[PDB]
Structure 1
Amino acid sequence: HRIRDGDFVVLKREDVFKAVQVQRRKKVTFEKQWFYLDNVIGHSYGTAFEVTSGGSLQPKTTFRDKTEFAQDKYIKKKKKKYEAIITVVKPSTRILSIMYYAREPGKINHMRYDTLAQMLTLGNIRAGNKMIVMETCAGLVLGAMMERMGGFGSIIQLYPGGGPVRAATACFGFPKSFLSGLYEFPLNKVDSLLHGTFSYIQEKQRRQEEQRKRHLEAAALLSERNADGLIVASRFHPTPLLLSLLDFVAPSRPFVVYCQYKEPLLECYTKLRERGGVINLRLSETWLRNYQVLPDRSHPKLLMSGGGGYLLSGFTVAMDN
């Protein structure tokens, strides 16, 4: 409800965001400035702040040549630049998805925030679902799913490398109640799993057996082959990902694959039309266009297109015999 110490938070100047964690005497930086996060605690979400010498405070010559609307555009820039206010908002898929696309698009394979929403809706994400995911978008997608589920259901995160990345995920600030339905399983044991061939020095041995334990838990749930959906969005070729992972899915369930480029999905589309047990394949793309709306000065600004990647969606079906 109210802001508290330790909680995760997003900042906002105008249309720029950055997420951080509230820690006593933890200097940070934002738009070339430097803050402290101590005085913010006892306020409500949505409170504005102005930089001071040290800590945040919470408040409540030819000028006339410019026309009425050009003078208001000239003032607004020179006042905002010298006097800039910083707000505090509670995190959300909306804010983070817009932020990461603007601050670190390379990390999330340029998945525009509009494209993300399509995946949440096309995959029918909701409370009481057993979902499968495999992403390299800093766990941003993992955070999006969790928000639409709300603790209900479960999620199985497939990962490469040492372990699953969940940086952006933490910025959501989920309770401990959601980690219950969160599991992980390495990606290099899937072909073994399909075939059924799958199997201070003390601090490691505890962390090791505790994790490998959690892996065999996931390996069982995967082995059920009865998922309620699949999502994929990584820096790898998606063609082979589906051809192996879709076997974990139950009939009449939705799936959605993202790809920064189109050519891989065109191969993935044919590799599915040949495979079997899928329908209503839909290679789609979404263009977005924001606007500026003021009276007698109303015009479109940007047309965000192409960088939003491409999506290959559909539903599952049983196989013949």
Structure 2
Amino acid sequence: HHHSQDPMNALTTIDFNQHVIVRLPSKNYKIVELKPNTSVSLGKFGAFEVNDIIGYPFGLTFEIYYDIGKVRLLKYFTVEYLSSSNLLQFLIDKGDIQRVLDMSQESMGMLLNLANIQSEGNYLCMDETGGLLVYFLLERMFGGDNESKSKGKVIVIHENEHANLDLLKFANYSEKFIKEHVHTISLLDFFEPPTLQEIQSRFTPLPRALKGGKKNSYYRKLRWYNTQWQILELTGEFLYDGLVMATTLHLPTLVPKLAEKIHGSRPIVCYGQFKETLLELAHTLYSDLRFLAPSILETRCRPYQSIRGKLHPLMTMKGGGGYLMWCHRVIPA
């Protein structure tokens, strides 16, 4: 803002203070924060100055060479946008596959379309991964644009007092963006919300001219009050445009309760690492007329060694990738 020149686009361009992906020659990923006037170490592959890569587009490979080395366009490294795909891959490389419930890129990609995820939708979500699912949703809805004019929201229902959304610290989202597009509510506040009466007995607002400590003790209470009021708005007769879930809670006695707040004709997608889990859910939903034709889906990707003359699928790879339970909320006659 203090520059006369137009800002750099961090969606297209390597920019200061962005969290960014770096692919090493060994093909594993690192996440790197681009603090001005600092250096970054890649162990055996050398170190480089952050300033020397700013302003380039993503997808380029830089060589580190020595007369902390210098960088030129091509040991070496490749700099990529921190996409939902790349974040998942980083977590897998890091060894956290069980923390992401064994999910794959194709399974999450399918979940996004089965769930009909759109910029203007309000989606009900459970995410036990630390926010990876939330991030897949947000990146598809807004593309990482903190200035999006779209009004869509992800409402995260969670098991503990607070939601675990720690992965969003890598997302390059402003606090404003997050507050506008992500709402969190515990399972207890969602299924047994406080009444307006119960809320008011703790605080009712004043009819602005406050100052000092009085202004600050008041707005903290008013903050609590607005939180409570948000819960009222989200738990009333409010109806959501879809339900997406990656939780290890017991689905057969959880999903029917969540689906009462979903509008008719909206998709429901439950991700699960184990098909037997979804099988039990599908049978439970078969006998509930509020659910249309629950289906268990599986998608698996097999890459090829893609060099001309020696074309063949990869000979080994990791198993897993999980399964999707897809169905639609409907209204019985």
Matched, 1:247 2:238: no
- Alpha carbons of 1:207 and 1:264: their partners in 2 closer, same or farther (altered >3 Å)? farther
Tell me what 1:222 maps to. 235
Any residues of structure 2 matched to 1:165-176 within 5 Å, and which?
A: 165-175=164-174, 176=176
Change in 2 beyond 3 A, CA 1:3/1:191: same
Partner amino acid for 1:101? I
In structure 2, stretches of 5+ residues that fail to align are: 1-8, 143-147, 200-213
Cα distance in 2 for partners of 1:51, 1:102 equals 23
Mapped partners of 2:48, 2:238: distance in 1: 50
Tell me whether 1:133 sits opposite 2:125 in the alignment. Answer: yes
Deviation readout 1:186-233 (Å, 9 max, x if unpaired): 12333313999985xx99997786356335303422323411101000
The answer to whether the 8 A contact 1:290-1:302 is kept is no
Contact kept? 1:39, 1:56, Cα under 8 Å: no
Cα distance between partner residues in 2 of 1:30 and 1:106: 26
Closer, same or farther in 2 for the Cα pair 1:219/1:43, shift >3 Å?
Answer: same
Distance 1:59 1:181 in 2: 39
Q: 1:296 aligned to 2:309?
A: yes
| Deviation, structure 1 residue 84 | 2.9
Q: Is the 8 A contact 1:288 1:303 kept in 2?
A: no
Q: Distance in 2 between matches of 1:115 and 1:31?
A: 33
Identify unmatched segments of 5+ residues in structure 1.
Answer: 61-82
> Normalising by structure 1, what TM-score?
0.79
Q: 1:17 aligns with which of 29, 32, 37?
A: 29
Q: How many residues align?
A: 297
CA distance in 2, matches of 1:3, 1:285: 36
What amino acid is the match of 1:179?
A: K
1:306 Cα shift? 5.0
1:1-321 aligned within 5 A:
1=9, 2-14=13-25, 15-24=27-36, 30=42, 35=47, 38-40=50-52, 42-46=54-58, 47-51=60-64, 55=68, 57-60=70-73, 84-103=75-94, 104-150=96-142, 151=148, 152=150, 153-175=152-174, 176-177=176-177, 179-193=179-193, 210=223, 213-302=226-315, 307-320=320-333
SS state at 1:58 partner: strand
Q: Distance in 2 between matches of 1:37 and 1:208?
A: 46
Comparing 105-114 with 168-177, which one deviates more in the overlay?
Answer: 168-177
CA distance in 1, matches of 2:92, 2:103: 7
Q: Kindly tell me: are residues 267 and 219 of structure 1, through their superposed partners in 2, closer, same or farther at Cα, counting changes over 3 Å?
A: farther
CA 1:206–1:101 in structure 2 vs 1: closer, same or farther (change >3 Å)?
farther
**Shift in CA distance, 19/318, structure 1 to aligned 2, threshold 3 Å:** same
Q: 1:243 to 1:30 in 2, by over 3 A?
A: farther
CA RMSD of aligned residues (A): 3.3
**TM-score using structure 2 length:** 0.77
Give the percent of matched residue pairs that are identical in Structure 1 and Structure 2: 22
**Change in CA separation of 1:89 and 1:260 when aligned onto 2, cut-off 3 Å:** same
Give the direction of change, closer, same or farther, for the CA distance of 1:305–1:16 in structure 2 (3 Å limit): closer
